[PDB]
């Protein structure tokens, strides 16, 4: 019946969510350098 189409759509949605999670991880990786610079700058001011 139509359940086969629903399962295929559900699998596609789950597969699509994996790509979105990868983009979130990629976005977080870029923000890590910015956060590290802020942490280093804050520590540098305290050290100075």
């Amino acid at each position: 019946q139509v359940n086969d189409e629903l399962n295929k759509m559900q699998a596609f949605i789950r597969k699509e969510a994996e790509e979105k999670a990868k983009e979130i991880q990629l976005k977080a990786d870029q923000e890590y350098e910015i956060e590290k610079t802020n942490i280093v700058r804050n520590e540098t001011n305290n050290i100075d």
Binding site: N3, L6, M9, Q10, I13, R14, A17
Partner: protein, 236 residues
């Protein structure tokens, strides 16, 4: 009929004492509910009057925790609609009519402070569900959504445990079991779509895995409920 009348008379005599009635009600709550149902089921005027008197004696204020016992009966056994139907019904005994009126008044007093959330909690405690109107009307599932996540999502955890138990007992595929499973799945889907913070709790408790595994059930209604739950999980 004579044996039933004698048993009812013995029950009334035992319930005449308050301590004895209080002890019997706690130990025979299912028996009390069955007697309440049979009161409306039976057509004999004497048997109905005896059953009403027995119910009133258990619900009499002289018994310990009389209000609590009456509330528990009206909640679990659905005593209030039965008493309402009996009041609308007719009986040949004036004493039976007076007992029915007293029972209806007690049930109305008990249900005055009742709430839809209380009914849902009682149903969850009973580990039974038959697509109750609280599980159908969006008002209850919207107002009580916040209360479901209270106490570290105690209600959600209880629902997940009930769903897991039904999945374990779903091999029978009984009609009542299938209805209970469908109602539990609908409740879980509602509590997941509203206040989605419980999705992580359900995944940790294994409720998501149980819901996914339940898609293999042969019941068409169970299959539709599983598809709806999957769509509410990650689908659209």
């Amino acid at each position: 009929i004579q044996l039933q009348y004698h048993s009812l008379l013995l029950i009334w005599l035992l319930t005449f004492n308050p301590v004895f009635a209080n002890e019997l009600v706690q130990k025979y709550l299912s028996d009390f509910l069955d007697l309440l149902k049979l009161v409306k089921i039976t057509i004999k005027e004497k048997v109905s009057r005896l059953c009403i008197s027995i119910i009133l004696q258990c619900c009499s204020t002289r018994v310990k925790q009389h209000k609590k016992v009456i509330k528990q009966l009206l909640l679990l056994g659905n005593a209030l609609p039965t008493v309402q139907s009996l009041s609308e019904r007719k009986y040949s005994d004036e004493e039976l009519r007076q007992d029915i009126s007293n029972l209806k008044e007690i049930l109305e007093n008990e249900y005055q402070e009742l709430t839809s959330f209380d009914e849902y909690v009682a149903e969850l405690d009973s580990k039974l569900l038959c697509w109750s109107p609280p599980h159908v009307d969006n008002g209850f599932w919207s107002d009580n959504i916040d209360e479901f996540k209270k106490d570290n999502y105690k209600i959600f955890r209880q629902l997940i445990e009930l769903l897991q138990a039904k999945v374990r007992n779903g091999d029978v595929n009984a009609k009542q079991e299938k209805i209970i499973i469908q109602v539990a799945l609908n409740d879980i889907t509602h509590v997941v779509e509203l206040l989605p913070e419980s999705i992580d709790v359900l995944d940790k408790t294994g409720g998501k895995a149980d819901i996914m595994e339940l898609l293999n059930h042969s019941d068409s209604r169970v299959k539709y409920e599983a598809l709806k739950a999957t769509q509410a999980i990650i689908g659209y």
